Subunit: 281 residues, 3 copies
């Protein structure tokens, strides 16, 4: 199923019939960082498998719902269960849920992820406001837009120089200052590793030389589809470890240690993003 105008429209039609919510904000939450979705008010939970033309996700299993409702007086739509390209999903499967968001009325997309630190000033537990990216799949002929262009959504050759909205970064930092946790908040360049193996010690050393501050396996595909169709983006990484320090000390990373960092920062990230949603212009 192609992520075209007709197919996205049929999914949006179903959603509008069931939910009655007209959202102008979308959210995609990272691994262990989804608590906010359980606090959406007057909410409606729609399993992906019920929505016409949504991608099949049963091989990977686990949760996959679209959730609509209100936060801070604002109308939102959330993806509960993100699609990752290391699972084997195609370009068309990644793009269709974002283009449905567009047809539903979304103008701002807020994204979180868990990532590895490269810049030496980053520690486990820090947040990074993403200000640009290095898209290794894109350079290597696996960009999320490879294929026919869907002209109704956007141009054949997008410019990404303003993909990460500057005023949204400034609002996120302002709220951290108001609540006295700005000492945790950095800005940086995100490198997209297709995955699913963690960056090796020598890949980490290479990324340091190339000007990368953070590395992870998500986010850049969704940012590109959003920018292509005119949706503004804020993207924030939670740092699980510093991979350069780990290479110097021969220390390993693993999914269990990552998720313990997520649990440590989940409630603060929930409070931060609730206020960001409330304060959006």
């Amino acid at each position: 199923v192609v992520a075209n105008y007709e197919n996205a429209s049929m999914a949006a039609d179903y959603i509008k019939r069931v939910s009655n919510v007209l959202p102008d904000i979308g959210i995609i939450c990272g691994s262990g960082l989804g608590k906010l979705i359980e606090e959406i008010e007057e909410r409606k939970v729609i399993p992906y498998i019920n929505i016409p033309n949504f991608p099949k996700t049963t091989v990977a299993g686990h949760v996959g719902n679209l959730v609509l409702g209100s936060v801070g007086g604002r109308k939102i739509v959330a993806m509960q269960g993100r699609l990752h390209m290391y699972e084997g999903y195609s370009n068309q499967e990644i793009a269709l849920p974002i283009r449905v968001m567009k047809l539903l009325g979304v103008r701002v997309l807020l994204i979180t992820n868990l990532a590895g630190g490269i810049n030496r000033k980053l520690k486990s537990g820090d947040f990074v406001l993403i200000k640009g990216h290095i898209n290794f799949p894109g350079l290597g002929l696996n960009n999320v837009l490879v294929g026919p262009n869907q002209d109704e959504f956007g141009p054949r050759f997008p410019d990404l120089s303003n993909a990460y909205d500057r005023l949204l970064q400034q609002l996120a930092l302002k709220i951290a200052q108001e609540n006295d946790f700005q000492d945790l908040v950095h800005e940086g360049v995100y490198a997209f590793n297709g995955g699913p193996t963690y960056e090796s010690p020598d890949e980490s050393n290479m990324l340091l030389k190339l000007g990368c501050d953070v590395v992870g396996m998500s986010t850049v595909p969704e940012v590109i589809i959003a920018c292509h169709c005119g949706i503004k983006v804020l993207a924030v990484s939670l740092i699980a470890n510093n991979s350069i320090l780990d290479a110097e000390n021969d220390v390993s990373i693993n999914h269990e240690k990552v998720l313990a960092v997520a649990e440590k920062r989940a409630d603060l990230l929930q409070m931060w993003f609730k206020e960001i949603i409330t304060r959006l212009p």
Copy 2:
């Protein structure tokens, strides 16, 4: 349809029946840089869709013709409507038209493209004679030769160290000197970005560190198929912008600005390549 000896032969048979031209020069012209094709003498226009085993191009649409005839007393074949890998074409679809050129008798392939400047001495409107490349799709398992080797055309493991003929570069520069526009002509290393998103500001900064002079989304696949089967190559980029300066000044690139640069330099590029064809040994 595989780009094998049998299938390429059937396409060449059709072409020979219709055109009567036996070319020894091939040309592939970049976006907005095709005016020379409209001035081929005693010419024959063959739509791709009529040629057995040529790739289907109707999803992308727009022009797609093979044009045979004479320029400067020399017999040539031109591709009018280039195939780009960001459209989703396979390795086999890109390679078959070049291998048909080989079977028709082509010994020299002349290529132009529109590209972004990385080296600080490059301005909008400059030309770059390409002397080597950095093939990010190739390093990343998307080389145009991934698949079975077609032994009749070339070896399993090609050497690319002489892919860009030195004497052809010298002839191009000599002609620019004769017509007093050598101040526009540089040489440089071409980085292949699969695309279709323009290089981001941080990708541009990375490419500067890695020794790239120019970046674009074409040309390297055709060069590799030509080198594999023994065809000599001249490749010239027209620079639309300097992406490093643009990142420093927060200025955007877009397809409209690119095509205005193409129109500005089209007639000079036409005159240059007409003389190159006339003067080839």
Copy 3:
């Protein structure tokens, strides 16, 4: 055919019925470096094409056998005819033979390859003990583990920091010292170029800047599948040329020169790996 638990089990069942050997060591030998397989004792040769669920290899042709028997009193299984990703094999086709090795009882995998030298201290004829890697296909969304995870074999997100066993490197070097050829033995970081074109002169210059010591077109996929399922690895490159010196002197590489280096070092590599097998803990 997916490289899952059921399918790997059916291949292992066939092999156990035919060979009676229960190996705990596996070997994969590089191009022109397979002489040791012809000296396996009380051996059993099983063509890939006879084994249920093994990948089809007739388009590429040439030898493809699994060979079981004894070396130095140890029980081994060898792949005679390696599968390379530049031939077009899928992730699932590369992984299934390694996962069959796991089910048969393999705990240690020994690998050799032919590679190009980047570090300036490497000469034609030198050996490199691989201590880490830079996986350009992996960064670019062509990692061998892209797809559903097969949970019975290993975790969704592997850590590769100990993929190249340190004690096995130390044993290999000790044996070289005992036989007075340690002057040929280096250690280094291996860059994976998907291929099949040799690294270009400008790609070589880039790899030097990025901390790569050696470059080649194999080995990293098998290492990752082995590490994922808990198999220890020793990987050794034989250097055919120095690509940085060749770029400075405008000298070419080709398959014929490569194989002459292989013949020059084949008998020493055979003796070295026989002793390594004998001495494994």
